Structure 1
C-alpha cells in the first residue's frame, strides 16, 4: 500500500522532466497521421499546449518554442516567426504595462482604491460592493495579480477592525471573511475583461485576429470597451449579489471607517507627480477610446488611414512619463540664482519600468501570435476546418454557449492566456464552418477564458487569495460554479443583444469568406 504512494510521489517529484520528455513521444503519431506540414504544425501546437498546461517549462520559455520548431520543421522561416513577437498589439500591451507601472509607482492606485472604499460605505453588502468595484476598476488598467495583491491587505485590515454569540457569531464572521477574500480575485478577473489592456487574452484575440483575418479592424480599445464594460458591470453585480447571499447574509462600522480614513491619511497629501500621472492616465484612456470608436468619427480620421493604431497612441502617451518632471516646475527658479540646481526627477525612469514590466507576458503574447501565424501558414487551419464538419448543423447561439462552456471549463486548470491561444484558431475555423461572423465565436472564447473562478490554479489572483489560508477549495469551487454559469449566461446575452450592433455581427463579413 505504501509502495504505491511512494511511486506516486516519485513520479510527481519529476513530473516536469517526465512530461517534457514524454510529450514529444506521445504526440509523434500526429505527424504521421496528418499531412506533413499540417501534421508538424499540429505537433508543435499540441506540444506547446501541453507544456503550458503542465508548466513543464516557464510559460515565456514555451512561448519561444515556435522560433525553434517552425524553422526546423519547415513550417515558417526565422525571419517570419521572429517578427510576429512584436506586432503592434504587443506594443499596446507594453504601453499599458508602462502606464500601470507609473500608476503603481506613485501609489495612485492605492489612493483611488481608498477613496472608492470611503465613498461606497461600510455596511457588509455595501463594503463587498465597494471592494469588488474597486478591484474591477483597477484591473481594467493594472494586472489582476497586482490588483488582488494590493486589495487583499486592505480587506484584511478592515475585517480585523470590524471584528476587533459563540457558534452563530463565529460562523457569521467566518463567512464574512471568506466572502471578502473571494470577492477580490473574482472582481479582478471580472474587470480585466472590460478593457483590451486589462488582461492578456484580449490582446491575444487582437493579434490572432491580425493573423487569421488581416482585414478585420472593427475590434479596438473603444469598441471592446463599449461591448465589455456593460457586461463587466452586469456580471460584477451578479457576482456581488451571489457572494453576499452566500456569505454576507443578503461601533464596528465606525472602527472600519476610521481605519479606512486613517490609511488614506497615511497616503499623505496629493503630490504633483500623482496629479500629472492621473492627467496622463485620463489622456491615455480618452485618446484610446476616441481614436476610432466606430460610431463617432475619431481623431484618427485627421491622419493617414491605415497608419495609426492604439499602440501608437499608447506609446506616445507613455513617452511623456519618461520626461515629464515629478516635482512642480516654478518660473521663480530661473530668476533665483541662489536656488539649488539639482536635476529633476521624471515621472517614470526606465529602470523602474524595466524592473516592473512583465516581459514574460509580452513574450507569451508574442509566442501566441507566432503560433497563430504558423497555424495559418502551414494550412493547419484549413485542415481543422475540414475536420470540423460534424458541427456545421449547430445553431450559432448554441455554438456560442457550448464553446463558452468548454473554454470556461478548460481555463479552470490552465492559464487564461494559454487557453485562449490554443482555442482561438479552432474558434475562428468553427465560425467559418457556421457562416457566422468570426467575432461572434472568438469574442465569447476570449471573455470565457477569463472565467477562472473554481480553483487556486485557475488564475494567479485565486492563488493569492488562497495564500491567505482561510479559503477552502470547496468554498471556491461552489462559488465559482455559479460564477461560471452566470458568466456564460451573461456572455451569451451580451453576444446576442448588443455585441451585434457594436461589432456588426448580424451579417457575414466579406473578409471572412
Structure 2
C-alpha cells in the first residue's frame, strides 16, 4: 500500500544522478515533491526541506544558495499576520465581533445564514480560516439543538465562507503569498506591482460577488420559523454575556490591527526600502509590550512568547520557502527557459481560454492536495508560458492563486471542511454536489475580475519589459 510512495523513487536516483543536463534533475525533484505534497504520508514542511537535500547532490546549487531562499520578505509578512491573528485568538475577541454582528443582522434563517457567511469571510480575511470554523460551528450546534436539510446548509456555509474570504487579504492564506514570492523571484524587475493595496483592490470585490453567489446557491439547493428567530437569540445573548464586558486588552489589539491596516494601505494609495514586511514586524513587535491591563510598571503584557511558539503555522513558512527554493533552482538549472521553449506554439491560442482552462484545472486539483502546494507547483509553468507567448504573466497567475483556494468538497482538501464534517450530518455526497457548482462559480467570477478591472490595475493588455 503506502510503502511504495517513498521507496519507489529510490529506483530513479542512480538513473538521474548522471543525466548530463540539470533541468532533468530539477524536474525529478519537483515531481517527487509534488507526489509527496499530494500524499500526506510525510508532512508538508518536511517535503519543503527536500530542495536543500537534493539540489546539492544533483550539482545544481550549494547548501547555501538554496537555504538562503527559505526566508524572505513574504514569509515574514505572513509571520507577522499570523502573530497578530494569534493575539486576536488569545482574547475572545473574534467571538465578540461575531456575536455583535449576528445580533445586529438578526435571527432570520435567511439573514442568519447571510450573517454567518459574511462574518466568517470577514474574520477569515486575517484570522486563520480553520480558527473561525472552530469558533463558529459550536454556535451553530447550540442554535440547532434549539431539518436535516438545514443543518447541512449552515455547516457548509461556514467552510465555504472561510475559504472564500481568505482570498481577500494578501496574508489570508498561503497561495497569495506564493504569488508574491514568485513575482519577486521570477520577475524581480516587478519590484512592487502586487502589494497589499493593489491585490486587495483586485480581490475584495471578487470575494463579495462570490460570497453573494454562494449564499444564493446554498439558499437554493437546501432552502428553495418564529422560535428559531427567537430561541436562537436567547442563545446568542447568553453566549455574549459569557465573554463579559469589553475587556480592555481587546481594545488595544483592535487599535494595533487598525494601525497595521492603515500603514499597509497608506504607503501605496525614491530608493524604497520600507516594504509591508516592516509594517507587519512593527505591529507584531508592538504586540509584546502593550499592557493588556490598567498600569495604574507593566507586569502584564497582552501577548507572551510561549503561546505564539505553540500557536503559529511554522510549517507553512517552511513550505513557502520550499517554493522559493524550487523557483530559484528552476531558474538556475535551465528548466524555465526550456519550458518557455516548448510552450512556443500556444501563440496561436486566445489567452482567455488559457486562463479559464488552467483556473478550472487548479480548482479541481486542489480538492485533493493542499492549496499552497498546488500553487507553488503550478505558477512557474504558467509564468514561463506567458513569457513565451508575449503575454502578461499576471493574467494567468492571479486566477490560479484565487482558484487554488476553491476547495469546496473533499474534506481532506482543506481542514475547515474536515472540521465541519466532524460534527456528523454532512454526508460527503451533499458536499460534492454543492461544491462542484461553487468551484464553477468561483472560476467565472475570477475570470470576470481579471478581464474587467485587473487590466487597469496591472496593465495586462501590454507585454511588460519586466518579462523580457
TM range (shorter): over 0.9
Match of 1:226 in 2: 201
Cα offset, 1:262, TM superposition? 1.2
Q: Counterpart of 2:231 in 1: which secondary structure?
A: helix
Q: Counterpart of 1:198 in 2: which secondary structure?
A: coil
For 2:360, which of 385, 405, 409 is the aligned residue?
405
Cα offset, 1:420, TM superposition? 0.3
Instruction: Establish whether residue 315 from structure 1 lines up as the match of residue 281 from structure 2.
Output: yes
Q: How does 1:223-302 map to 2 (within 5 A)?
A: 223-249=198-224, 251-292=227-268, 296=269
For 2:52, which of 62, 67, 70 is the aligned residue?
67
Q: How does 1:9-408 map to 2 (within 5 A)?
A: 11=1, 15=2, 17-25=3-11, 36-161=21-146, 173-216=147-190, 217-249=192-224, 251-292=227-268, 296=269, 305-330=271-296, 343-408=298-363
Judge conservation of contact 2:17–2:58 (CA < 8 Å) in 1. no
Cα offset, 1:248, TM superposition? 2.3
For residues 348 and 220 of structure 2, the distance between their equivalents in structure 1, rounded to whole angstroms, comes to: 40
Cα offset, 1:31, TM superposition? 7.2
User: Would you say how many aligned residue pairs link Structure 1 and Structure 2?
Assistant: 465
For residues 294 and 126 of structure 2, the distance between their equivalents in structure 1, rounded to whole angstroms, comes to: 26
For residues 274 and 374 of structure 1, the distance between their equivalents in structure 2, rounded to whole angstroms, comes to: 45
For residues 144 and 70 of structure 1, the distance between their equivalents in structure 2, rounded to whole angstroms, comes to: 34
For residues 177 and 162 of structure 2, the distance between their equivalents in structure 1, rounded to whole angstroms, comes to: 17
Match of 1:498 in 2: 453
Judge conservation of contact 1:38–1:378 (CA < 8 Å) in 2. yes
Match of 2:462 in 1: 507
Cα offset, 1:463, TM superposition? 1.1
For residues 134 and 41 of structure 1, the distance between their equivalents in structure 2, rounded to whole angstroms, comes to: 44
> Gapped runs of 5+ residues in structure 2?
none
Cα offset, 1:389, TM superposition? 2.9
For residues 470 and 146 of structure 1, the distance between their equivalents in structure 2, rounded to whole angstroms, comes to: 21
For residues 494 and 421 of structure 1, the distance between their equivalents in structure 2, rounded to whole angstroms, comes to: 22
* Cα 1:79/1:157, change in 2 over 3 Å: same
For residues 116 and 30 of structure 1, the distance between their equivalents in structure 2, rounded to whole angstroms, comes to: 58
Cα offset, 1:132, TM superposition? 0.6
Judge conservation of contact 2:169–2:200 (CA < 8 Å) in 1. yes
> Gapped runs of 5+ residues in structure 1?
1-10, 162-172, 297-303, 331-340
**TM-score when scaled to structure 1?**
0.88
For residues 346 and 110 of structure 2, the distance between their equivalents in structure 1, rounded to whole angstroms, comes to: 44
Judge conservation of contact 1:439–1:505 (CA < 8 Å) in 2. yes
> Which structure has the greater CA radius of gyration?
1
For 1:452, which of 407, 412, 421 is the aligned residue?
407
Deviations 1:463-498 (A, max 9, x none): 111111211111111111110111110000000001
